[PDB]
Amino acid sequence: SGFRKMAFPSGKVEGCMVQVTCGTTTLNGLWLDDVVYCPRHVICTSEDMLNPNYEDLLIRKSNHNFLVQAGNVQLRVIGHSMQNCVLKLKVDTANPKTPKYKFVRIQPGQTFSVLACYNGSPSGVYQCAMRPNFTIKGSFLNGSCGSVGFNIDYDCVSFCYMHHMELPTGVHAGTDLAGNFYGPFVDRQTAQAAGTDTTITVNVLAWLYAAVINGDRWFLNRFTTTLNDFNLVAMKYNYEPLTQDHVDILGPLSAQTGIAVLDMCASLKELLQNGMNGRTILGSALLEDEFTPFDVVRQCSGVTFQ
Amino acid sequence: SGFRKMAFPSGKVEGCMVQVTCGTTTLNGLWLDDVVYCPRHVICTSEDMLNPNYEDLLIRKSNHNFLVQAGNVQLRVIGHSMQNCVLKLKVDTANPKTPKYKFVRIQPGQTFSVLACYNGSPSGVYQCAMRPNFTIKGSFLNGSCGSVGFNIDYDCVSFCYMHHMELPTGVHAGTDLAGNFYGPFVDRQTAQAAGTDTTITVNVLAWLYAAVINGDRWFLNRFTTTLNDFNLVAMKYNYEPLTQDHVDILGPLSAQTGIAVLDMCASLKELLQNGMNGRTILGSALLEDEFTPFDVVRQCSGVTFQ
Numbered sequence: 001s002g003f004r005k006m007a008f009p010s011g012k013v014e015g016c017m018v019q020v021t022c023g024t025t026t027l028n029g030l031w032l033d034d035v036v037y038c039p040r041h042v043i044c045t046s047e048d049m050l051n052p053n054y055e056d057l058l059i060r061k062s063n064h065n066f067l068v069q070a071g072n073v074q075l076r077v078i079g080h081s082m083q084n085c086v087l088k089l090k091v092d093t094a095n096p097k098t099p100k101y102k103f104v105r106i107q108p109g110q111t112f113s114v115l116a117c118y119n120g121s122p123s124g125v126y127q128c129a130m131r132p133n134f135t136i137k138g139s140f141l142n143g144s145c146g147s148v149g150f151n152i153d154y155d156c157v158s159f160c161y162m163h164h165m166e167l168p169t170g171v172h173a174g175t176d177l178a179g180n181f182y183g184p185f186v187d188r189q190t191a192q193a194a195g196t197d198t199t200i201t202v203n204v205l206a207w208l209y210a211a212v213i214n215g216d217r218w219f220l221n222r223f224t225t226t227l228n229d230f231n232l233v234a235m236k237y238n239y240e241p242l243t244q245d246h247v248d249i250l251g252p253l254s255a256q257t258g259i260a261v262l263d264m265c266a267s268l269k270e271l272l273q274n275g276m277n278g279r280t281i282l283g284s285a286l287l288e289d290e291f292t293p294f295d296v297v298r299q300c301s302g303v304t305f306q
Numbered sequence: 307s308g309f310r311k312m313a314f315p316s317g318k319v320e321g322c323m324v325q326v327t328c329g330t331t332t333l334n335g336l337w338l339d340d341v342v343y344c345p346r347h348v349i350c351t352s353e354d355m356l357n358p359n360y361e362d363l364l365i366r367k368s369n370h371n372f373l374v375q376a377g378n379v380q381l382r383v384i385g386h387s388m389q390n391c392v393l394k395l396k397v398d399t400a401n402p403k404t405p406k407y408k409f410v411r412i413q414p415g416q417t418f419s420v421l422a423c424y425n426g427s428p429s430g431v432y433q434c435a436m437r438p439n440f441t442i443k444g445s446f447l448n449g450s451c452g453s454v455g456f457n458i459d460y461d462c463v464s465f466c467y468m469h470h471m472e473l474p475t476g477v478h479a480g481t482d483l484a485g486n487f488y489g490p491f492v493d494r495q496t497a498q499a500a501g502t503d504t505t506i507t508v509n510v511l512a513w514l515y516a517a518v519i520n521g522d523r524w525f526l527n528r529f530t531t532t533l534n535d536f537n538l539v540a541m542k543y544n545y546e547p548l549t550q551d552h553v554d555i556l557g558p559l560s561a562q563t564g565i566a567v568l569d570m571c572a573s574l575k576e577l578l579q580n581g582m583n584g585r586t587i588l589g590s591a592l593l594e595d596e597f598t599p600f601d602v603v604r605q606c607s608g609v610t611f612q
């Protein structure tokens with residue numbers, strides 16, 4: 001028992017991190033087969049930054065303008081190309097540590113692990129969610145761009161995130177591995193705002209089930225509700241709407257605890273309306289929303305990875 | 307910016323995890339050089355559990371009674387011995403993935419990453435602290451014993467924890483890698499209690515500095531205090547005493563933020579005495595106590611590992 005913000009083991013991803021340096025700029029790259037993926041703004045100088053044209057900046061570049069370093073080994077860049085906001089540096093050496101992977105694009109509400117890196121070296125790993133406003137609440141300093149987010153499926157690393165930028169509420173924006181930003185953000189040093197966030201309701205309910213599974217029951221209740229009356233409460237408290245597929249996805253947790261989804265909704269309603277009365281759930285005095293239903297089942301059933 | 311419970315990258319630890327099976331019992335082992343370290347209660351059967359004598363149980367055993375599996379490769383056990391609550395299984399193959407490592411015994415308040423494993427396969431990674439009562443608030447299921455806790459320091463893995471058991475408040479007890487438990491606990495299926503826990507004051511203060519560094523300032527105040535008057539407040543609220551060594555350890559954070567340690571204590575005072583008034587700090591509605599001062603500097607300065 002117990003419930004922790006648990007990341008995926010990071011070893012298959014650590015073997016893919018390299019350092020990419022162009023001019024006066026260093027960041028991280030992801031080296032899969034004979035391609036290094038990294039944020040295209042590596043080609044940017046500090047004055048290019050306010051409104052760059054990357055197409056013009058890239059055609060100005062030669063393969064030798066890119067220092068790609070895999071620890072204390074320099075990879076020779078033998079080609080390059082830009083796909084949306086990511087650079088793809090073809091190198092003459094395929095990564096012998098390449099795991100089974102794919103590139104996936106995740107949905108808001110979905111979670112992933114981030115392997116925060118600087119100079120191609122892993123600094124730490126932590127669990128994130130794609131917020132409904134397509135930001136993530138990460139921990140990223142200068143140098144961290146090109147660090148990636150990922151999930152694992154038995155042996156397969158699903159890369160879903162590459163870090164690009166920090167917005168002024170201290171939240172973070174990035175792309176999938178095809179270079180397309182999550183949300184309306186662009187890789188420009190121009191004023192941009194995240195927009196109002198909402199709480200991921202299906203994740204809160206999943207975390208309440210996690211709580212019951214670990215014997216934390218003080219919040220439940222006799223009552224039930226309908227999907228419609230619950231969702232009218234979600235409106236008031238800036239919770240995202242609960243769908244039937246959300247209900248359907250909570251079924252397994254519902255079946256293991258014997259608490260109907262709509263009963264858990266009734267408990268969430270009373271928590272929303274009255275607060276927690278100085279109590280905690282799973283060690284938090286806030287309703288936690290970056291655990292998906294799968295996160296809860298994985299952690300409470302001990303799914304492993306090879 | 308931002309602040310997350312960050313674990314160390316788990317790659318070098320994943321390369322040492324194996325499965326150990328003796329009789330009807332499977333748990334995890336740690337394979338370093340030609341030795342596999344695991345909980346000695348692997349030699350236990352469902353009736354030995356209650357009051358076991360491990361030195362009779364081990365002399366009963368032969369090398370062939372131990373199935374050590376490193377993925378889909380069985381290691382031959384060529385010798386065995388018991389060091390306190392750990393078995394050392396001598397095998398004929400040295401782990402080629404052995405990192406630079408060292409066995410450390412940590413102090414309460416210190417943090418570490420846990421790589422939770424089942425059947426020798428990693429399930430996830432998360433950050434824990436050694437509580438003042440020598441338990442850890444982990445996330446562990448049956449099968450998880452032998453999973454290890456660690457820190458990384460440049461290239462060197464400092465192993466500090468191996469998991470052994472769960473106590474009935476849902477908290478966990480284990481040993482260092484020399485087999486000595488943290489705390490008064492014994493590897494027997496008999497009634498044991500964790501004892502009253504306290505809050506790690508120095509870590510709360512360090513986390514408050516993390517908050518300031520990340521622009522979260524609402525809790526600060528005009529006031530200061532003395533180490534003695536503060537400690538009378540810590541007394542009431544079940545906070546550990548704050549030492550001058552603790553103040554000295556917080557100096558760098560004090561230096562970077564410009565907030566004297568005793569000024570932060572005055573803020574912590576007043577948070578203790580009034581609560582947070584419906585506000586959050588670094589995304590929590592509780593005062594968080596498993597970030598050490600080093601954790602804060604590492605995460606807020608981007609220290610990496612090779």
Ligand SMILES: *[C@H](O)[C@H](C[C@@H]1CCNC1=O)NC(=O)[C@H](CC1CC1)NC(=O)[C@@H](NC(=O)OCc1ccccc1)C(C)C
Nearest residue numbers: 041140141142143144145164165166187189190191192307
């Ligand atoms: C790459 O390592 C770095 C990561 C940042 C630095 C600190 N934490 C991070 O996550 N990324 C950048 O420096 C990017 C480069 C631009 C993406 C091309 N820039 C930023 O993250 C800046 N943010 C920014 O310009 O946001 C838009 C904005 C909003 C309001 C006012 C001005 C600009 C950072 C450095 C502020």
Ligand SMILES: *[C@H](O)[C@H](C[C@@H]1CCNC1=O)NC(=O)[C@H](CC1CC1)NC(=O)[C@@H](NC(=O)OCc1ccccc1)C(C)C
Nearest residue numbers: 001347446447448449450451470471472493495496497498
């Ligand atoms: C090893 O895989 C396993 C890990 C446990 C199982 C579930 N969560 C965990 O962390 N450890 C055990 O099964 C150990 C074996 C004994 C150490 C030899 N036993 C336990 O963890 C049990 N705990 C226990 O007996 O605590 C003492 C106690 C307290 C009160 C009443 C009776 C006993 C678990 C299974 C309850």
